Symmetry: none
Subunit: 72 residues, 6 copies
Protein backbone atom coordinates (compact mmCIF):
# COMPACT_ATOMS: atom_id res chain seq x y z
CA UNK A 1 0.00 0.00 0.00
CA UNK A 2 1.39 3.42 -1.08
CA UNK A 3 -0.13 6.54 0.52
CA UNK A 4 1.29 9.49 -1.48
CA UNK A 5 -1.27 12.39 -1.49
CA UNK A 6 0.21 15.78 -2.51
CA UNK A 7 -0.88 19.34 -1.71
CA UNK A 8 0.52 21.75 -4.36
CA UNK A 9 -2.06 24.53 -3.84
CA UNK A 10 -1.19 28.23 -4.18
CA UNK A 11 -3.32 30.26 -1.74
CA UNK A 12 -3.23 34.07 -1.38
CA UNK A 13 -5.30 36.72 0.39
CA UNK A 14 -4.81 40.38 -0.58
CA UNK A 15 -7.03 42.59 1.58
CA UNK A 16 -7.30 46.33 2.40
CA UNK A 17 -6.01 48.98 -0.05
CA UNK A 18 -3.57 47.66 -2.67
CA UNK A 19 -2.05 49.22 -5.81
CA UNK A 20 -3.90 52.60 -5.63
CA UNK A 21 -2.55 55.86 -7.16
CA UNK A 22 -3.30 59.24 -5.50
CA UNK A 23 -1.99 62.09 -7.71
CA UNK A 24 -1.91 65.63 -6.17
CA UNK A 25 -4.94 64.76 -3.88
CA UNK A 26 -4.82 67.74 -1.43
CA UNK A 27 -3.94 70.38 -4.08
CA UNK A 28 -6.77 72.88 -3.39
CA UNK A 29 -7.48 75.49 -0.70
CA UNK A 30 -9.08 74.90 2.76
CA UNK A 31 -10.15 77.92 4.85
CA UNK A 32 -11.64 77.53 8.37
CA UNK A 33 -12.74 80.69 10.24
CA UNK A 34 -14.16 80.22 13.74
CA UNK A 35 -15.28 83.09 16.01
CA UNK A 36 -17.19 83.36 19.39
CA UNK A 37 -17.72 79.59 19.58
CA UNK A 38 -18.08 77.13 22.53
CA UNK A 39 -17.79 73.34 23.17
CA UNK A 40 -19.27 71.66 26.30
CA UNK A 41 -18.29 68.11 25.20
CA UNK A 42 -15.40 66.11 23.65
CA UNK A 43 -14.07 67.29 20.24
CA UNK A 44 -12.28 65.40 17.45
CA UNK A 45 -11.32 67.64 14.48
CA UNK A 46 -9.42 67.05 11.20
CA UNK A 47 -8.70 70.00 8.86
CA UNK A 48 -6.88 69.42 5.51
CA UNK A 49 -5.13 66.14 6.56
CA UNK A 50 -4.16 63.18 4.28
CA UNK A 51 -3.18 60.37 6.75
CA UNK A 52 -2.54 56.73 5.79
CA UNK A 53 -4.07 54.82 8.74
CA UNK A 54 -3.73 51.03 8.52
CA UNK A 55 -5.03 48.56 11.17
CA UNK A 56 -4.46 44.80 10.61
CA UNK A 57 -5.85 42.57 13.42
CA UNK A 58 -6.42 39.97 10.63
CA UNK A 59 -4.02 38.51 8.04
CA UNK A 60 -2.88 35.45 10.07
CA UNK A 61 -2.17 32.08 8.41
CA UNK A 62 -2.56 28.74 10.26
CA UNK A 63 -2.59 25.05 9.38
CA UNK A 64 -3.57 22.16 11.64
CA UNK A 65 -2.50 18.77 10.16
CA UNK A 66 -2.84 15.18 11.46
CA UNK A 67 -1.15 11.94 10.37
CA UNK A 68 -1.90 8.46 11.76
CA UNK A 69 -0.92 4.93 10.67
CA UNK A 70 -2.15 1.80 12.55
CA UNK A 71 -1.43 -1.90 12.24
CA UNK A 72 -3.66 -4.44 14.00
CA UNK B 1 3.06 0.17 3.76
CA UNK B 2 4.71 3.38 2.40
CA UNK B 3 3.21 6.46 4.07
CA UNK B 4 4.73 9.36 2.06
CA UNK B 5 2.20 12.28 1.97
CA UNK B 6 3.65 15.67 0.88
CA UNK B 7 2.70 19.31 1.53
CA UNK B 8 4.25 21.61 -1.14
CA UNK B 9 1.59 24.37 -0.88
CA UNK B 10 2.51 28.09 -1.08
CA UNK B 11 0.44 30.23 1.30
CA UNK B 12 0.56 34.03 1.54
CA UNK B 13 -1.43 36.80 3.19
CA UNK B 14 -0.82 40.44 2.27
CA UNK B 15 -3.06 42.75 4.28
CA UNK B 16 -3.27 46.52 5.02
CA UNK B 17 -1.88 49.14 2.60
CA UNK B 18 0.44 47.63 -0.06
CA UNK B 19 2.04 49.14 -3.18
CA UNK B 20 0.10 52.47 -3.16
CA UNK B 21 1.59 55.67 -4.73
CA UNK B 22 0.99 59.12 -3.19
CA UNK B 23 2.35 61.89 -5.48
CA UNK B 24 2.58 65.48 -4.06
CA UNK B 25 -0.33 64.67 -1.63
CA UNK B 26 -0.38 67.74 0.71
CA UNK B 27 0.50 70.30 -2.02
CA UNK B 28 -2.34 72.82 -1.42
CA UNK B 29 -3.05 75.53 1.19
CA UNK B 30 -4.69 75.06 4.64
CA UNK B 31 -5.67 78.16 6.67
CA UNK B 32 -7.22 77.90 10.17
CA UNK B 33 -8.19 81.14 11.99
CA UNK B 34 -9.69 80.78 15.47
CA UNK B 35 -10.82 83.68 17.72
CA UNK B 36 -12.68 84.05 21.11
CA UNK B 37 -13.17 80.29 21.39
CA UNK B 38 -13.65 77.85 24.33
CA UNK B 39 -13.45 74.07 25.11
CA UNK B 40 -14.79 72.55 28.38
CA UNK B 41 -13.86 68.96 27.41
CA UNK B 42 -11.06 66.91 25.76
CA UNK B 43 -9.80 67.95 22.30
CA UNK B 44 -8.07 66.00 19.53
CA UNK B 45 -6.98 68.14 16.54
CA UNK B 46 -5.07 67.43 13.30
CA UNK B 47 -4.33 70.33 10.91
CA UNK B 48 -2.53 69.55 7.62
CA UNK B 49 -1.10 66.16 8.78
CA UNK B 50 0.05 63.30 6.50
CA UNK B 51 0.92 60.58 9.08
CA UNK B 52 1.57 56.94 8.15
CA UNK B 53 0.11 55.05 11.14
CA UNK B 54 0.34 51.24 11.03
CA UNK B 55 -1.01 48.86 13.72
CA UNK B 56 -0.47 45.08 13.25
CA UNK B 57 -1.90 43.00 16.14
CA UNK B 58 -2.53 40.35 13.42
CA UNK B 59 -0.17 38.79 10.85
CA UNK B 60 0.72 35.69 12.97
CA UNK B 61 1.79 32.37 11.37
CA UNK B 62 1.23 29.00 13.18
CA UNK B 63 1.55 25.26 12.41
CA UNK B 64 0.09 22.52 14.59
CA UNK B 65 1.15 19.07 13.31
CA UNK B 66 0.61 15.58 14.80
CA UNK B 67 2.22 12.25 13.82
CA UNK B 68 1.42 8.81 15.31
CA UNK B 69 2.40 5.27 14.26
CA UNK B 70 1.13 2.14 16.11
CA UNK B 71 2.07 -1.49 15.65
CA UNK B 72 0.02 -4.09 17.60
CA UNK C 1 6.63 0.16 7.23
CA UNK C 2 8.07 3.40 5.76
CA UNK C 3 6.72 6.56 7.44
CA UNK C 4 8.24 9.44 5.42
CA UNK C 5 5.66 12.32 5.43
CA UNK C 6 7.08 15.69 4.20
CA UNK C 7 6.25 19.35 4.81
CA UNK C 8 7.89 21.58 2.13
CA UNK C 9 5.18 24.31 2.20
CA UNK C 10 6.29 27.98 1.99
CA UNK C 11 4.21 30.21 4.27
CA UNK C 12 4.44 34.04 4.54
CA UNK C 13 2.38 36.84 6.06
CA UNK C 14 3.14 40.46 5.10
CA UNK C 15 0.86 42.81 6.99
CA UNK C 16 0.72 46.58 7.66
CA UNK C 17 2.08 49.16 5.20
CA UNK C 18 4.53 47.71 2.62
CA UNK C 19 6.10 49.01 -0.62
CA UNK C 20 4.23 52.38 -0.62
CA UNK C 21 5.75 55.47 -2.37
CA UNK C 22 5.32 58.98 -0.87
CA UNK C 23 6.69 61.64 -3.27
CA UNK C 24 7.07 65.27 -1.94
CA UNK C 25 4.26 64.53 0.60
CA UNK C 26 4.13 67.70 2.80
CA UNK C 27 4.85 70.21 0.01
CA UNK C 28 2.05 72.80 0.51
CA UNK C 29 1.32 75.52 3.08
CA UNK C 30 -0.27 75.21 6.57
CA UNK C 31 -1.24 78.36 8.53
CA UNK C 32 -2.79 78.16 12.04
CA UNK C 33 -3.69 81.46 13.81
CA UNK C 34 -5.23 81.30 17.29
CA UNK C 35 -6.38 84.27 19.44
CA UNK C 36 -8.15 84.64 22.86
CA UNK C 37 -8.77 80.90 23.07
CA UNK C 38 -9.23 78.57 26.08
CA UNK C 39 -9.06 74.83 27.01
CA UNK C 40 -10.35 73.45 30.38
CA UNK C 41 -9.43 69.83 29.49
CA UNK C 42 -6.73 67.69 27.80
CA UNK C 43 -5.55 68.62 24.28
CA UNK C 44 -3.80 66.52 21.62
CA UNK C 45 -2.70 68.64 18.62
CA UNK C 46 -0.77 67.88 15.41
CA UNK C 47 0.02 70.73 12.98
CA UNK C 48 1.83 69.86 9.71
CA UNK C 49 3.22 66.47 10.92
CA UNK C 50 4.23 63.49 8.73
CA UNK C 51 5.00 60.81 11.38
CA UNK C 52 5.74 57.18 10.50
CA UNK C 53 4.26 55.32 13.53
CA UNK C 54 4.41 51.49 13.55
CA UNK C 55 3.03 49.18 16.30
CA UNK C 56 3.44 45.38 15.88
CA UNK C 57 2.09 43.41 18.88
CA UNK C 58 1.37 40.68 16.25
CA UNK C 59 3.65 39.07 13.63
CA UNK C 60 4.64 35.97 15.71
CA UNK C 61 5.66 32.53 14.33
CA UNK C 62 5.04 29.16 16.14
CA UNK C 63 5.31 25.38 15.59
CA UNK C 64 3.64 22.85 17.82
CA UNK C 65 4.67 19.40 16.60
CA UNK C 66 4.11 15.93 18.13
CA UNK C 67 5.64 12.54 17.23
CA UNK C 68 4.84 9.14 18.80
CA UNK C 69 5.68 5.55 17.81
CA UNK C 70 4.32 2.49 19.72
CA UNK C 71 5.20 -1.18 19.52
CA UNK C 72 3.12 -3.73 21.50
CA UNK D 1 -34.96 92.84 37.19
CA UNK D 2 -34.59 89.85 39.55
CA UNK D 3 -32.94 86.75 38.04
CA UNK D 4 -33.39 84.05 40.70
CA UNK D 5 -33.72 80.60 38.99
CA UNK D 6 -33.33 77.64 41.41
CA UNK D 7 -32.23 74.05 40.80
CA UNK D 8 -33.52 71.69 43.56
CA UNK D 9 -33.28 68.45 41.52
CA UNK D 10 -32.38 65.09 43.10
CA UNK D 11 -30.56 62.88 40.55
CA UNK D 12 -29.47 59.31 41.27
CA UNK D 13 -27.97 56.48 39.19
CA UNK D 14 -27.86 52.90 40.54
CA UNK D 15 -26.19 50.50 38.11
CA UNK D 16 -24.72 46.96 38.20
CA UNK D 17 -25.95 44.49 40.85
CA UNK D 18 -27.64 46.10 43.89
CA UNK D 19 -29.52 44.52 46.81
CA UNK D 20 -29.44 40.82 45.70
CA UNK D 21 -29.60 37.94 48.26
CA UNK D 22 -27.69 34.67 47.52
CA UNK D 23 -28.49 31.88 50.04
CA UNK D 24 -26.26 28.71 50.03
CA UNK D 25 -25.67 29.08 46.20
CA UNK D 26 -22.71 26.66 45.74
CA UNK D 27 -24.23 24.04 48.11
CA UNK D 28 -24.28 21.04 45.71
CA UNK D 29 -21.58 18.66 44.45
CA UNK D 30 -19.12 19.25 41.55
CA UNK D 31 -16.97 16.37 40.24
CA UNK D 32 -14.34 16.77 37.46
CA UNK D 33 -12.31 13.76 36.20
CA UNK D 34 -9.75 14.37 33.39
CA UNK D 35 -7.47 11.65 31.90
CA UNK D 36 -5.08 11.23 28.86
CA UNK D 37 -5.93 14.72 27.64
CA UNK D 38 -4.02 17.35 25.60
CA UNK D 39 -4.29 21.13 24.86
CA UNK D 40 -2.42 22.71 21.90
CA UNK D 41 -3.87 26.19 22.64
CA UNK D 42 -4.63 28.64 25.48
CA UNK D 43 -6.95 27.60 28.35
CA UNK D 44 -9.23 29.50 30.73
CA UNK D 45 -11.00 27.18 33.23
CA UNK D 46 -13.44 27.69 36.14
CA UNK D 47 -14.56 24.74 38.29
CA UNK D 48 -16.96 25.39 41.20
CA UNK D 49 -16.08 29.13 41.62
CA UNK D 50 -18.46 31.84 43.00
CA UNK D 51 -16.50 35.12 42.47
CA UNK D 52 -17.96 38.65 42.66
CA UNK D 53 -16.21 40.43 39.73
CA UNK D 54 -17.04 44.17 39.48
CA UNK D 55 -15.78 46.59 36.76
CA UNK D 56 -16.77 50.32 36.88
CA UNK D 57 -15.31 52.52 34.08
CA UNK D 58 -18.65 54.46 34.29
CA UNK D 59 -20.31 56.17 37.28
CA UNK D 60 -18.60 59.60 37.00
CA UNK D 61 -20.63 62.81 37.57
CA UNK D 62 -19.96 66.23 35.94
CA UNK D 63 -21.61 69.66 35.87
CA UNK D 64 -20.72 72.48 33.49
CA UNK D 65 -22.31 75.82 34.41
CA UNK D 66 -22.01 79.25 32.71
CA UNK D 67 -23.11 82.65 34.02
CA UNK D 68 -22.91 85.93 32.07
CA UNK D 69 -24.46 89.36 32.76
CA UNK D 70 -24.06 92.28 30.31
CA UNK D 71 -24.86 96.00 30.48
CA UNK D 72 -24.51 98.23 27.39
CA UNK E 1 -30.43 94.21 38.47
CA UNK E 2 -30.19 91.32 40.98
CA UNK E 3 -28.57 88.13 39.63
CA UNK E 4 -29.01 85.46 42.33
CA UNK E 5 -29.32 82.00 40.64
CA UNK E 6 -29.03 79.02 43.05
CA UNK E 7 -27.96 75.40 42.64
CA UNK E 8 -29.26 73.23 45.53
CA UNK E 9 -29.31 69.96 43.50
CA UNK E 10 -28.27 66.61 45.05
CA UNK E 11 -26.47 64.37 42.51
CA UNK E 12 -25.39 60.81 43.37
CA UNK E 13 -23.95 57.79 41.53
CA UNK E 14 -23.78 54.27 42.99
CA UNK E 15 -22.24 51.80 40.55
CA UNK E 16 -20.84 48.24 40.69
CA UNK E 17 -21.98 45.79 43.38
CA UNK E 18 -23.75 47.39 46.39
CA UNK E 19 -25.64 46.02 49.40
CA UNK E 20 -25.72 42.34 48.24
CA UNK E 21 -25.90 39.50 50.85
CA UNK E 22 -24.02 36.19 50.28
CA UNK E 23 -24.91 33.55 52.93
CA UNK E 24 -22.68 30.38 53.09
CA UNK E 25 -21.87 30.70 49.31
CA UNK E 26 -19.09 28.10 48.79
CA UNK E 27 -20.72 25.57 51.15
CA UNK E 28 -20.89 22.46 48.90
CA UNK E 29 -18.22 20.04 47.65
CA UNK E 30 -15.76 20.54 44.73
CA UNK E 31 -13.59 17.62 43.51
CA UNK E 32 -10.98 17.83 40.69
CA UNK E 33 -8.97 14.75 39.58
CA UNK E 34 -6.44 15.26 36.74
CA UNK E 35 -4.14 12.56 35.26
CA UNK E 36 -1.69 12.10 32.29
CA UNK E 37 -2.53 15.56 30.97
CA UNK E 38 -0.60 18.15 28.86
CA UNK E 39 -0.72 21.94 28.04
CA UNK E 40 1.28 23.51 25.15
CA UNK E 41 -0.03 27.09 25.79
CA UNK E 42 -0.99 29.48 28.64
CA UNK E 43 -3.38 28.29 31.40
CA UNK E 44 -5.61 30.30 33.74
CA UNK E 45 -7.44 28.09 36.27
CA UNK E 46 -9.81 28.76 39.19
CA UNK E 47 -11.03 25.87 41.37
CA UNK E 48 -13.40 26.69 44.25
CA UNK E 49 -12.60 30.47 44.36
CA UNK E 50 -14.85 33.16 45.88
CA UNK E 51 -12.85 36.37 45.21
CA UNK E 52 -14.23 39.91 45.35
CA UNK E 53 -12.43 41.63 42.44
CA UNK E 54 -13.20 45.35 42.09
CA UNK E 55 -11.86 47.67 39.35
CA UNK E 56 -12.78 51.40 39.34
CA UNK E 57 -11.22 53.45 36.51
CA UNK E 58 -14.53 55.45 36.63
CA UNK E 59 -16.26 57.23 39.54
CA UNK E 60 -14.59 60.69 39.17
CA UNK E 61 -16.34 64.02 40.00
CA UNK E 62 -15.77 67.38 38.18
CA UNK E 63 -17.23 70.92 38.21
CA UNK E 64 -16.48 73.45 35.48
CA UNK E 65 -17.93 76.89 36.25
CA UNK E 66 -17.60 80.26 34.45
CA UNK E 67 -18.67 83.72 35.65
CA UNK E 68 -18.42 86.96 33.64
CA UNK E 69 -19.88 90.42 34.28
CA UNK E 70 -19.51 93.30 31.77
CA UNK E 71 -20.39 96.97 32.15
CA UNK E 72 -20.13 99.20 29.02
CA UNK F 1 -25.78 95.43 39.97
CA UNK F 2 -25.83 92.63 42.55
CA UNK F 3 -24.12 89.51 41.17
CA UNK F 4 -24.60 86.85 43.86
CA UNK F 5 -24.88 83.37 42.19
CA UNK F 6 -24.70 80.44 44.70
CA UNK F 7 -23.71 76.76 44.46
CA UNK F 8 -24.98 74.66 47.42
CA UNK F 9 -25.25 71.37 45.44
CA UNK F 10 -24.15 68.10 47.11
CA UNK F 11 -22.40 65.75 44.65
CA UNK F 12 -21.26 62.20 45.55
CA UNK F 13 -19.91 59.13 43.75
CA UNK F 14 -19.66 55.66 45.33
CA UNK F 15 -18.28 53.08 42.91
CA UNK F 16 -16.93 49.52 43.17
CA UNK F 17 -18.08 47.13 45.91
CA UNK F 18 -19.73 48.84 48.93
CA UNK F 19 -21.80 47.54 51.89
CA UNK F 20 -21.90 43.87 50.74
CA UNK F 21 -22.23 41.11 53.44
CA UNK F 22 -20.30 37.80 53.04
CA UNK F 23 -21.25 35.25 55.76
CA UNK F 24 -19.04 32.10 56.21
CA UNK F 25 -18.13 32.35 52.48
CA UNK F 26 -15.54 29.54 51.94
CA UNK F 27 -17.28 27.06 54.27
CA UNK F 28 -17.47 23.95 52.02
CA UNK F 29 -14.83 21.50 50.78
CA UNK F 30 -12.34 21.84 47.85
CA UNK F 31 -10.26 18.80 46.73
CA UNK F 32 -7.62 18.95 43.92
CA UNK F 33 -5.60 15.84 42.89
CA UNK F 34 -3.05 16.21 40.04
CA UNK F 35 -0.79 13.43 38.63
CA UNK F 36 1.71 13.03 35.69
CA UNK F 37 0.71 16.43 34.37
CA UNK F 38 2.72 18.90 32.25
CA UNK F 39 2.79 22.64 31.27
CA UNK F 40 4.97 24.05 28.42
CA UNK F 41 3.67 27.61 28.99
CA UNK F 42 2.68 30.17 31.69
CA UNK F 43 0.23 29.09 34.44
CA UNK F 44 -2.01 31.12 36.74
CA UNK F 45 -3.85 28.98 39.33
CA UNK F 46 -6.22 29.74 42.23
CA UNK F 47 -7.46 26.89 44.42
CA UNK F 48 -9.84 27.82 47.27
CA UNK F 49 -8.99 31.59 47.28
CA UNK F 50 -11.23 34.34 48.72
CA UNK F 51 -9.23 37.51 47.92
CA UNK F 52 -10.55 41.07 48.12
CA UNK F 53 -8.65 42.78 45.24
CA UNK F 54 -9.38 46.49 44.67
CA UNK F 55 -7.93 48.74 41.92
CA UNK F 56 -8.88 52.47 41.82
CA UNK F 57 -7.12 54.45 39.05
CA UNK F 58 -10.38 56.54 38.94
CA UNK F 59 -12.17 58.41 41.77
CA UNK F 60 -10.55 61.90 41.36
CA UNK F 61 -12.15 65.28 42.30
CA UNK F 62 -11.58 68.59 40.37
CA UNK F 63 -12.88 72.19 40.31
CA UNK F 64 -12.16 74.52 37.41
CA UNK F 65 -13.65 77.94 38.12
CA UNK F 66 -13.27 81.24 36.20
CA UNK F 67 -14.27 84.77 37.28
CA UNK F 68 -13.91 88.03 35.30
CA UNK F 69 -15.41 91.51 35.74
CA UNK F 70 -14.96 94.29 33.12
CA UNK F 71 -15.76 98.02 33.32
CA UNK F 72 -15.54 100.21 30.17
Amino acid sequence: IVYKPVDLSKVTSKCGSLGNIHHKPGGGQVEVKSEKLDFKDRVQSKIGSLDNITHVPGGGNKKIETHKLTFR
